[PDB]
């Protein structure tokens, strides 16, 4: 969907409507903690809206925004991101910041998660039809943006004590829940591309396509916010006693001169049993740029590990030329199974072929 960096436009309409939908649908028996956190969320409507548009303006964005796409049908290196994995990453960060009362930052992250959900609920994104593949990509989003006011909805159809919402709370595994919830909306979106929204179809078809995918984006966003309010009100932990199949690193590089690096970068772990795994951190684009925030996903060789089995974690640099760079990370977070399990301020130089321990 379109958005503008000042937190306006289609993306902003979707999250704003998301909150309003939820206010309308919330049943009488909702816990008081949930209503209070909803009030905190509304105190932070600006950041919700800003985060819902920011990813399109992020200087660190991938060149073709590859991670804003996801097809719902289709261990020595890091794994790339998709619209679906970003929803999960930003949701964990949001829950993490919420638990410590950092509500402005939490709500921004929440908004970012919702940017990615909103995208996978377009027709073009879950169909993988880019602006390069089709003139209709931009045309359709502009058509929707111009008409966004007429596609606003103010209820999901049902109160929060009813099926659509209670089904959202049934699965305490947030990540598994989110993936299949998003999957359902993205299949309807991809279906709408082929049935109504592509350049093969008519203006009436586009109108119907916008009506349905915008309604779905708003209803689905309401559901995510609902899940979020329950999660942070109960301190729900979605990772509890689950095998760590993979780790996600979220690394903020300092904005200081020459803080970034082009040297080889590795993330690594050592278990209680003395076993190690190391991966190179190397995303498609230009990693570890001064002031950027990079995301890496690492798949574990051993699929039967609990988080507490991971005793040590480090990052390690290796000079690419005869002149060792220096790299200065501001902070690194490590996420396992939907929970931030390490939040390490660094703010110090890693000079040549040095290792820095993050746990
Ligand atoms: Ca590379
Ligand atoms: Ca670079
Ligand atoms: Zn968008």
Give 261 Cα–ligand 1 centroid separation in angstroms. Answer: 13
Measured CA to CA, the distance from residue 307 to residue 89 in angstroms comes to: 17
Q: What residues are neighbours of ligand 1 (ion), with CB under 5 Å?
A: 282
Q: How many CB atoms lie within 10 A of CB 158?
A: 14
Residues ≥6 apart with Cβ < 8 Å to 305: 243, 244, 271
Domain count, the chain: 2
In a shared domain, residues 127 and 183: yes
In a shared domain, residues 44 and 161: yes
Which of 211, 239, 267 is where one domain is finished?
239
Task: State the number of CA atoms in the 13 A half-sphere of 301 facing the CB.
Answer: 12
Measured CA to CA, the distance from residue 90 to residue 86 in angstroms comes to: 6
Measured CA to CA, the distance from residue 339 to residue 231 in angstroms comes to: 12
1 assigned binding-site residue: yes
Q: If you ran DSSP here, which 8-state letter would residue 70 be given?
A: -
In a shared domain, residues 103 and 32: yes
Q: Which residue has the tokens 């501001």?
A: 330
In a shared domain, residues 246 and 144: no
In a shared domain, residues 133 and 50: yes
In a shared domain, residues 225 and 272: no
- Residue 283: left (phi > 0), alpha (psi -120 to 50), or beta? beta
For residue 250, which phi and psi values (nearest 5 degrees)? -120, 105
In a shared domain, residues 83 and 143: yes
Ligand nearest to the CA of 290: 2
Helices (H) and strands (E) in the chain, counts: 9, 8
Per-residue tokens: 326: 């220096």
What CATH number is associated with residue 143?
1.10.575.10
Q: Helix (H, G, I), strand (E, B), or coil: what is residue 252? A: strand
Measured CA to CA, the distance from residue 295 to residue 165 in angstroms comes to: 31
258 assigned binding-site residue: yes
Measured CA to CA, the distance from residue 8 to residue 13 in angstroms comes to: 7
For residue 268, which phi and psi values (nearest 5 degrees)? -150, 160
Give 121 Cα–ligand 3 centroid separation in angstroms. Answer: 9
Residues ≥6 apart with Cβ < 8 Å to 301: 75, 277
Give 76 Cα–ligand 1 centroid separation in angstroms. Answer: 13
Is residue 73 within 8 A of residue 190, CB to CB? The reply is yes
Per-residue tokens: 142: 């502009």
Residues ≥6 apart with Cβ < 8 Å to 347: 254, 328, 329, 330, 331
Give 118 Cα–ligand 3 centroid separation in angstroms. Answer: 6
In a shared domain, residues 87 and 19: yes
In a shared domain, residues 184 and 280: no
Which residues sit opposite 313 in a β-bridge?
A: 269
Assign 3-state DSSP to the chain and report helix, strand, coil percentages, each to 5.
Answer: 45, 15, 40
Give 266 Cα–ligand 1 centroid separation in angstroms. Answer: 13
- What residue numbers bound the domain in which 107 lies? 1-239
Ligand nearest to the CA of 261: 2
> Rounded to an integer, what is the distance from CA 11 to the centroid of its chain?
14
Give 58 Cα–ligand 1 centroid separation in angstroms. Answer: 20
> Rounded to an integer, what is the distance from CA 111 to the centroid of its chain?
9
Q: How many CB atoms lie within 10 A of CB 108?
A: 25
In a shared domain, residues 261 and 128: no
Per-residue tokens: 359: 């746990």
Measured CA to CA, the distance from residue 280 to residue 19 in angstroms comes to: 40
């Amino acid at each position: 969907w379109d958005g503008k960096i000042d937190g306006t436009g289609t993306h902003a309409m979707i999250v704003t409507q998301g909150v309003s939908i939820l206010e309308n649908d919330l049943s009488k028996n909702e816990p008081e903690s949930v209503r209070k956190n909803l009030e905190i969320l509304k105190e932070n409507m600006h950041e919700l809206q800003l985060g819902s548009t920011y990813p399109d303006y992020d200087k660190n964005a991938y060149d073709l925004y590859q991670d804003h796409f996801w097809d719902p049908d289709t261990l020595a290196y890091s794994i790339p991101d998709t619209g679906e994995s970003q929803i999960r990453k930003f949701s964990a960060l949001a829950r993490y910041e919420w638990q410590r009362g950092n509500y402005k930052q939490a709500t921004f992250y929440l908004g970012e998660a919702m940017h990615y959900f909103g995208d996978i609920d377009t027709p073009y994104h879950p169909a993988n039809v880019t602006a390069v593949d089709s003139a209709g990509h931009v045309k359709f989003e502009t058509f929707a943006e111009e008409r966004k006011e007429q596609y606003k909805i103010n209820t999901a159809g049902c109160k929060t004590n009813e099926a659509f919402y209670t089904d959202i709370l049934k699965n305490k595994d947030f990540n598994a829940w989110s993936k299949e919830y998003a999957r359902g909306f993205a299949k309807t979106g991809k279906s709408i591309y082929y049935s109504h929204a592509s350049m093969s179809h008519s203006w009436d078809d586009w109108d119907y396509a916008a009506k349905v995918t915008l309604a779905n984006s708003q209803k689905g966003t309401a559901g995510y916010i609902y899940r979020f309010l329950h999660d942070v009100s109960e301190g729900n932990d979605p990772s509890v006693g689950k095998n760590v199949k993979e780790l996600v690193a979220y690394i903020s590089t300092s904005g200081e001169k020459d803080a970034g690096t082009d040297d080889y970068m590795y993330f690594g772990i050592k278990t209680k049993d003395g076993k190690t795994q190391e991966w190179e951190m190397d995303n498609p684009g230009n990693d570890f740029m001064t002031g950027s925030k990079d995301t890496y996903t690492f798949k574990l060789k051993d699929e039967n590990l609990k988080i507490d089995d991971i005793q040590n974690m480090w990052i390690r640099k290796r000079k690419y030329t005869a002149f060792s760079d220096a790299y200065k990370p501001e902070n690194i977070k490590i996420i396992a199974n939907g929970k931030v399990v390490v939040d390490k301020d660094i703010n110090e130089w890693i000079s040549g072929n040095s290792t820095y321990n993050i746990k």
